[PDB]
Design a protein around this ligand. Structure first.
Ligand code: CA
Ligand code: CA
Ligand code: CA
Ligand code: CA
Ligand code: ZN
Length: 316
């Protein structure tokens, strides 16, 4: 809507206070005009009809429990936009400042968050397995990254290409978590997963096997569930990414880490310049090696580490 840009204050899912960009026109709306064509957050009101109604508030103060998921979805979408703009010089997910839209309070006791091809959607969780999903910055970044992938490589959401699609979202979800410096780690969804259990997460990039996911190509899932194991086989690529950044010896293969910044630069280039809709793991390796070569030279330590990481997880 048309109005005056202002700043409100509220509390997120984890109870932390933060300032959020809003728009004033009779009511204060969760519409951030400071980033691209805007960031809009909607209330789905426990229904499944999307996007719902643009979030309206009477006093620009968002401290009600019902407001929490909206505050975080709005705020973290902004942080993710900042990451892509400042680190990769990319304006929004389409590269042309497309408006970012998110809906919270989707359905009832819904334990998922997703990108539906046009916007992000967040459930409130059942309170046991998950609390409002927008409370996890890696979750929000994971979802917005699916939008970036759709507009670039376009990796089909099935089998190996789908696993790469998933890994890319976990990788950048984690890099954004580090960018915001919000208790960063290499775990996925730890902030909103099982509030009654501390120290766990949905997936682990440092050690995928901790939750039963494969950490080597020889252990890849070949079944039909989960669209050919897109959330399972992503562990193989997540482990490779972790090794490239942090280093380590996996299955007897030693990798010299090159850091998170270079990991991001290599994978962003691979994603935007070399990957295609049907790329498989072997092609991802080729794309990553070529990207590192473009950026650091064929005889660089960076290229060497990329090769070692993929060798470690069995991807030739
Ligand atoms: Ca209020
Ligand atoms: Ca964390
Ligand atoms: Ca995390
Ligand atoms: Ca937990
Ligand atoms: Zn995903």
């Amino acid at each position: 809507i048309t109005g005056t840009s202002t700043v409100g204050v509220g509390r997120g899912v984890l109870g932390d206070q933060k300032n959020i960009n809003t728009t004033y026109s009779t009511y204060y709306y969760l519409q951030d005009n400071t980033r691209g064509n805007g960031i809009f957050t909607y209330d789905a009101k426990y229904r499944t009809t999307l996007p719902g109604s643009l979030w309206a508030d009477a006093d620009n103060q968002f401290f009600a429990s019902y407001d929490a998921p909206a505050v975080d979805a709005h705020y973290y979408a902004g942080v993710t936009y900042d990451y892509y703009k400042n680190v990769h010089n990319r304006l929004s997910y389409d590269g042309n400042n497309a408006a970012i839209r998110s809906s919270v309070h989707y359905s009832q006791g819904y334990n998922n968050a997703f990108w539906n091809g046009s916007q992000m959607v967040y459930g409130d969780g059942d309170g046991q397995t998950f609390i409002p999903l927008s409370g996890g910055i890696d979750v929000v970044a994971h979802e917005l990254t699916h939008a970036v992938t759709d507009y670039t490589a376009g990796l089909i959401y099935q089998n190996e290409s789908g696993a790469i699609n998933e890994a890319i979202s976990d990788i950048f979800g984690t890099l954004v978590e580090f960018y915001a410096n919000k208790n960063p780690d290499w775990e996925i969804g730890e902030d909103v997963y099982t509030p009654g259990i501390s120290g766990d997460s949905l997936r682990s990039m440092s050690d995928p096997a901790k939750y039963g996911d494969p950490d080597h190509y020889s252990k890849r899932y070949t079944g039909t569930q989960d669209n050919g194991g897109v959330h399972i086989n992503s562990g193989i690529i997540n482990k490779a990414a972790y090794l490239i950044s942090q280093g380590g010896t996996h299955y007897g293969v030693s990798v010299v880490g090159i850091g998170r910044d270079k990991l991001g630069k290599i994978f962003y280039r691979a994603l935007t310049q070399y990957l295609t809709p049907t790329s498989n793991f072997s092609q991802l390796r080729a794309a990553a090696v070529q990207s590192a070569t473009d950026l650091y030279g064929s005889t660089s330590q960076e290229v060497a580490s990329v090769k070692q990481a993929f060798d470690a997880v069995g991807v030739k």
